[PDB]
Amino acid sequence: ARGPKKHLKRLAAPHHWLLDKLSGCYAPRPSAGPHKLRESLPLIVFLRNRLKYALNGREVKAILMQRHVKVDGKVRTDTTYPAGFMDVITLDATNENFRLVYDVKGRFAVHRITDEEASYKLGKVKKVQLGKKGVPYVVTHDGRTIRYPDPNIKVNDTVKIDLASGKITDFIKFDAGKLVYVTGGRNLGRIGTIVHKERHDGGFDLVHIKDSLDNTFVTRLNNVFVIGEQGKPYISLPKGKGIKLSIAEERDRRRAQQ
Amino acid sequence: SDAVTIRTRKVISNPLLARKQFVVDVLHPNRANVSKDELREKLAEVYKAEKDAVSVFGFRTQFGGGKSVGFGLVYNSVAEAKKFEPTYRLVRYGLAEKVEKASRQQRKQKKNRDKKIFGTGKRLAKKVARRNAD
Amino acid sequence: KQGFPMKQGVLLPTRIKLLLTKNVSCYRPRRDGERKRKSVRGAIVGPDLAVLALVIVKKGEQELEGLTDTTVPKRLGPKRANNIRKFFGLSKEDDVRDFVIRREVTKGEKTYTKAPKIQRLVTPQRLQRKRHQRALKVRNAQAQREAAAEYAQLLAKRLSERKAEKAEIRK
Amino acid sequence: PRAPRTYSKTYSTPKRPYESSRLDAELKLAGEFGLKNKKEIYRISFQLSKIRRAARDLLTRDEKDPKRLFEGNALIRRLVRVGVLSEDKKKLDYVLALKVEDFLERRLQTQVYKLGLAKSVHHARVLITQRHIAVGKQIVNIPSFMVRLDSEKHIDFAPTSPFGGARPGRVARRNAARKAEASG
RNA sequence: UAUCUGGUUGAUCCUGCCAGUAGUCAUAUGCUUGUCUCAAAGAUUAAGCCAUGCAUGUCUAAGUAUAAGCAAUUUAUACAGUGAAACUGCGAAUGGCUCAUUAAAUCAGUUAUCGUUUAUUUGAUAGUUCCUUUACUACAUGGUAUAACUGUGGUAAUUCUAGA
RNA sequence: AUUCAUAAUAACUUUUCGAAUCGCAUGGCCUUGUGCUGGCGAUGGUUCAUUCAAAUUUCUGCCCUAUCAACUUUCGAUGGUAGGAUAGUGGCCUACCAUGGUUUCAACGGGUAACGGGGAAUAAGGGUUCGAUUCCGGAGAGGGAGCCUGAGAAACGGCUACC
Ligand SMILES: [Mg+2]
Ligand SMILES: [Mg+2]
Ligand SMILES: [Mg+2]
Ligand SMILES: [Mg+2]
Ligand SMILES: [Mg+2]
Ligand SMILES: [Mg+2]
Ligand SMILES: [Mg+2]
Ligand SMILES: [Mg+2]
Ligand SMILES: [Mg+2]
Ligand SMILES: [Mg+2]
Ligand SMILES: [Mg+2]
Ligand SMILES: [Mg+2]
Ligand SMILES: [Mg+2]
Ligand SMILES: [Mg+2]
Ligand SMILES: [Mg+2]
């Protein structure tokens, strides 16, 4: 109404932030950035609610204004800077590195990666199009535009970004039998080794996916993120590796140790 | 006092704010309400840094008494504790003094009076006095 | 009377009402794009004027007590580099750094001149800024040329592979 | 603008206001368990009613239903945990026919009574209310506490109270000072 | 917790309604009111009318300071410390309130923009502009007004303003 | 799926943009001249992408009324051609042209003590009643209309006129 909104009430923020409904009227509205508002960590939730490295929103500002936190190798002093899937967070103190990946329950999980694994990232290409002066470029899922890509790169593929220069190191093609990571939908946070996809000319592609335990499920194409060949992936998968155990089997595992 | 047996749980190191965060767990049988001023001293000795770099808050006494659980922070030095701690808690321990200030309504009305004046206002002061003669 | 000012050359010595805008006298806006309707009194002089504003352009022979005997100095001196130059008309190379009008102030027994500044003056720092911006355009253009050449070399090589690929095809 | 605080009522009034049978059985329960109101009986009936509402929906489902297996075991576990459900009856069919006062058997004052310590059910309520009973190392002054068959053996007097030691009491202290001035 | 009872008859079985009965994040009202937690709250009638006071302003190392501001830096004769005012840049189109209008209208789910605008954020991205382009030319950088400010003032009054 | 992305040719423009801006660090090279190079940032800027949005838009779905059965098309109703306007599509508006469109499967008109949903109360099952109001979308700033600034307002703790 009359212009863009700037406040985000609680009970209206995305449910995967895990914000307690009481203790506050508002929620951190993610700023404009590489990732959608609906799928965004931004650091205030990450620093305080996930890592417990702050007690308030004031201490988060104190941490960020001293250039400790950085996203993709850049300081990102903004307190509500939207951090999305596959973003790499580096903290100079504690010598810790992070990669934003979804837990099997559909939530962003705290994942600690080594220094070497923080030297790259994967991005799902969204469109391959010619720029001005006939310069082709690829647009990844985090808004990164990379000029002069490989001619064999097509949409729905995954490229590897150096994160020191925006150059592409290697790319994974979208073919049957590739290890994929489900990003969005009821099957969010699952890893499933594509078997085949349905064409459905007109829109809303469908792909059939079955994980290691031979559980098959179907999700829309735009929710699929290829993360390498079957078996060894190109990133360190979080604990559980996206299995989606049933509730009956889950409690027995919780009852195994107590 | 008598079997104070201060315990700190869930201790985590936070060099980003240059401190340590832990949950203070205090047992005070036959006694009540361990009175943080004493809590800071014993907490300071355990981490042996100083008293001025130690702050505590929370400490809701359990039902029936005999126990109290709160929060505590231990900084690396006074410089960190004097730059990250809130002003309201620094004045609790005497490390800072509560600056004198008028009421909220007094400042609001004073600010609105300024809005009615364009420029510094020295020129109208002499002009008002000159017109006050006649 | 009632203080309504006299707008420059309008009409009609009777007071009127106008819609006043930016860069228009008798109105100081309090908002961006705000316009207000105020009463302004006409330019023609009438018998309802409480005061007049007069300016002397030529001096006669009789001496005024407080207009010719006494004089007041300009409060501020020039600040821009060429405004310093235009003040004295020296040259474009006479190092205007030391031609600054200074005003001593005595709060106590200590005095200081506090010469304001020379804006738009040539500084070695400014030459560095021009040097960097000029040099950056050279490297940025060259980098794209190198990147474009590498893409063309890769594109031509792949086509050569396709040329030999279909050569084996169709017997 | 803030998330509303969820609340619910925990009792159900009977449909008929006056009948001899219910007005007798309910008062028999209150007298034999030392309860202040009829609302303390309506509360158990309401709580049991929701238990048999879920157990009927589970039984009408197919055997080895993944929902029934998860929910049926969880429902039985809670009743077994607090002692309402015996160990020999875990079929989810004895849940539907447990009783009204099986829950009243596991309340604090009844169980405080059962392990001596009150020598009357009404003496247990005042002892609990007056901050004398500690379930663990913690004082519980709620007469309806529903011990969970593990804190059953840990019911004991509060250390920071008379009958546990460390002080004679309030009126005992005043009484003792009376003979002190009387002796002199 | 898938339940009914009293009332037409001298008495009976029905139709049938009246009455009773239980609940209400449905209000109001009456009598009464010891404790802890939690909590709606000028919606219904009048989107009727409002005294008063607040609710939108904002700075860094990094736009413009000779405050004829404050103090001593003393590394400084141009400034370089803090900093009123004002110019500039942003924001004021968010939030908060209310439910009068509104019956394929709004709205809910579901679609499209191969039919468009988009400050801000993030990622890329101007060697080509001495114009008769060999003296036209400042490119170690080119002009103007004005606010703040000094002083003269007008009206009873306004976040009014004029002349210098 | 395209007259798409993109490139090329011929011109056009009264002409946009293509850094006369700021802070900190002061380092290298000599024919040591205030000579030539040289870092980390801030602000700004053309185009594309991206994000925050907006506008329009497809299908299905709303309470009571026939003591509302025909309604719409003077001067816009339904559609075509062309143009103007708009950020764009479109009777959005204009000129010419055709007589079209909706309706007992309830149009149209009247009523609502009607903002719409997510929901609330009571219920064996099926339902009935309610939803101004903690969230989402809409509308308004006493009733109307008009408009400046701006990316975004028909803005009212902005302006203008009438009542
Ligand atoms: Mg609003
Ligand atoms: Mg925000
Ligand atoms: Mg009869
Ligand atoms: Mg009779
Ligand atoms: Mg009735
Ligand atoms: Mg109403
Ligand atoms: Mg940009
Ligand atoms: Mg047309
Ligand atoms: Mg037409
Ligand atoms: Mg209404
Ligand atoms: Mg609302
Ligand atoms: Mg409005
Ligand atoms: Mg009103
Ligand atoms: Mg208006
Ligand atoms: Mg108001």
Curated annotation (Swiss-Prot), chain A:
Keyword entries, A-Z: Cytoplasm, Isopeptide bond, Phosphoprotein, Ribonucleoprotein, Ribosomal protein, RNA-binding, rRNA-binding, Ubl conjugation
GO molecular function, one term: structural constituent of ribosome
GO biological process, alphabetically ordered: cytoplasmic translation; translation
Keyword Ubl conjugation part of the UniProt annotation: yes
Phosphothreonine PTM sites in chain numbering: T114
Alphabetized Gene3D superfamilies for the sequence: 2.30.30.30, 2.40.50.740, RNA-binding S4 domain
Domain S4 RNA-binding: 41-104
SMART domains in UniProt: S4
Keyword Repeat: no
Pfam short name (any one): RS4NT
Cellular component aspect of the GO annotation: 90S preribosome; cytoplasm; cytosol; cytosolic small ribosomal subunit
Glycyl lysine isopeptide (Lys-Gly) (interchain with G-Cter in ubiquitin) cross-link site: K61, K133, K160, K167, K173, K178, K210, K232
Major subcellular location class: cytoplasm
Family statement drawn from the similarity comment of this UniProt entry: Belongs to the eukaryotic ribosomal protein eS4 family.
Other observations noted: Present with 573 molecules/cell in log phase SD medium. There are 2 genes for eS4 in yeast.
Subunit annotation: Component of the small ribosomal subunit (SSU). Mature yeast ribosomes consist of a small (40S) and a large (60S) subunit. The 40S small subunit contains 1 molecule of ribosomal RNA (18S rRNA) and 33 different proteins (encoded by 57 genes). The large 60S subunit contains 3 rRNA molecules (25S, 5.8S and 5S rRNA) and 46 different proteins (encoded by 81 genes).
Name of the molecule in the record: Small ribosomal subunit protein eS4A
Organism (species): Saccharomyces cerevisiae (strain ATCC 204508 / S288c)
Taxonomy of the source species: Eukaryota, Fungi, Dikarya, Ascomycota, Saccharomycotina
Gene: RPS4A
Swiss-Prot record, chain B:
SUPFAM superfamilies: Ribosomal proteins S24e, L23 and L15e
Family annotation (Gene3D superfamilies): 3.30.70.3370
Gene Ontology CC, one term: cytosol
Alphabetical GO biological process terms: cytoplasmic translation; maturation of SSU-rRNA from tricistronic rRNA transcript (SSU-rRNA, 5.8S rRNA, LSU-rRNA)
Places the protein is found: Cytoplasm
Keywords: Acetylation, Cytoplasm, Isopeptide bond, Phosphoprotein, Ribonucleoprotein, Ribosomal protein, Ubl conjugation
Pfam families the UniProt entry points to: Ribosomal_S24e
Superkingdom of this protein's organism: Eukaryota
Residue positions, PTM N-acetylserine: S1
Signal sequence interval, chain numbering: none
Region (Disordered): 101-134
Biased composition (Basic residues): 104-114, 123-134
Cross-link (Glycyl lysine isopeptide (Lys-Gly) (interchain with G-Cter in ubiquitin)): K20
Sites bearing Phosphoserine, chain numbering: S13, S55
Post-translational modification, as annotated: N-terminally acetylated by acetyltransferase NatA. Also partially acetylated by NatC.
Family listed: Belongs to the eukaryotic ribosomal protein eS24 family.
Note: There are 2 genes for eS24 in yeast.
Function: Component of the ribosome, a large ribonucleoprotein complex responsible for the synthesis of proteins in the cell. The small ribosomal subunit (SSU) binds messenger RNAs (mRNAs) and translates the encoded message by selecting cognate aminoacyl-transfer RNA (tRNA) molecules. The large subunit (LSU) contains the ribosomal catalytic site termed the peptidyl transferase center (PTC), which catalyzes the formation of peptide bonds, thereby polymerizing the amino acids delivered by tRNAs into a polypeptide chain.
Protein name: Small ribosomal subunit protein eS24A
Organism: Saccharomyces cerevisiae (strain ATCC 204508 / S288c)
Swiss-Prot record, chain C:
Protein name, UniProt field: Small ribosomal subunit protein eS6A
Molecular-function GO term, any one: structural constituent of ribosome
Modified residues (Phosphothreonine): T106
Function as written in the Swiss-Prot or TrEMBL entry: Component of the ribosome, a large ribonucleoprotein complex responsible for the synthesis of proteins in the cell. The small ribosomal subunit (SSU) binds messenger RNAs (mRNAs) and translates the encoded message by selecting cognate aminoacyl-transfer RNA (tRNA) molecules. The large subunit (LSU) contains the ribosomal catalytic site termed the peptidyl transferase center (PTC), which catalyzes the formation of peptide bonds, thereby polymerizing the amino acids delivered by tRNAs into a polypeptide chain.
Additional information: Present with 66000 molecules/cell in log phase SD medium. There are 2 genes for eS6 in yeast.
Subunit structure: Component of the small ribosomal subunit (SSU). Mature yeast ribosomes consist of a small (40S) and a large (60S) subunit. The 40S small subunit contains 1 molecule of ribosomal RNA (18S rRNA) and 33 different proteins (encoded by 57 genes). The large 60S subunit contains 3 rRNA molecules (25S, 5.8S and 5S rRNA) and 46 different proteins (encoded by 81 genes). Interacts with snoRNA U3. uS11 interacts with MPP10. Component of the ribosomal small subunit (SSU) processome composed of at least 40 protein subunits and snoRNA U3.
Location in or out of the cell: Cytoplasm; Nucleus, Nucleolus
Domain of life per record: Eukaryota
Swiss-Prot record, chain D:
Keywords: Cytoplasm, Isopeptide bond, Nucleus, Phosphoprotein, Ribonucleoprotein, Ribosomal protein, Ribosome biogenesis, RNA-binding, rRNA processing, rRNA-binding, Ubl conjugation
GO molecular-function terms, A-Z: rRNA binding; structural constituent of ribosome
Domain of life of the native organism: Eukaryota
PROSITE patterns: RIBOSOMAL_S4, S4
GO CC annotation terms, alphabetical: 90S preribosome; cytoplasm; cytosol; cytosolic small ribosomal subunit; nucleolus; nucleoplasm; small-subunit processome
Any Pfam family matching the protein: Ribosomal_S4
Cross-referenced SMART domains: Ribosomal_S4, S4
Chain intervals for the UniProt region annotation (Disordered): 159-184
Domain S4 RNA-binding: 106-180
Record's subcellular location: Cytoplasm; Nucleus, Nucleolus
InterPro entries listed in its UniProt record: Ribosomal_uS4 (IPR022801), Ribosomal_uS4_CS (IPR018079), Ribosomal_uS4_euk/arc (IPR005710), Ribosomal_uS4_N (IPR001912), S4_RNA-bd (IPR002942), S4_RNA-bd_sf (IPR036986)
Glycyl lysine isopeptide (Lys-Gly) (interchain with G-Cter in ubiquitin) crosslink, residue number(s): K179
GO biological-process terms attached to the record: maturation of SSU-rRNA from tricistronic rRNA transcript (SSU-rRNA, 5.8S rRNA, LSU-rRNA); ribosomal small subunit biogenesis; translation
Chain positions with Phosphoserine modification: S183
Annotated NCBIfam families: PRK04051.1, uS4_arch
Family: Belongs to the universal ribosomal protein uS4 family.
Further facts: Present with 106000 molecules/cell in log phase SD medium. There are 2 genes for uS4 in yeast.
Name of this protein: Small ribosomal subunit protein uS4A
Organism: Saccharomyces cerevisiae (strain ATCC 204508 / S288c) (Baker's yeast)
Lineage: Eukaryota, Fungi, Dikarya, Ascomycota, Saccharomycotina
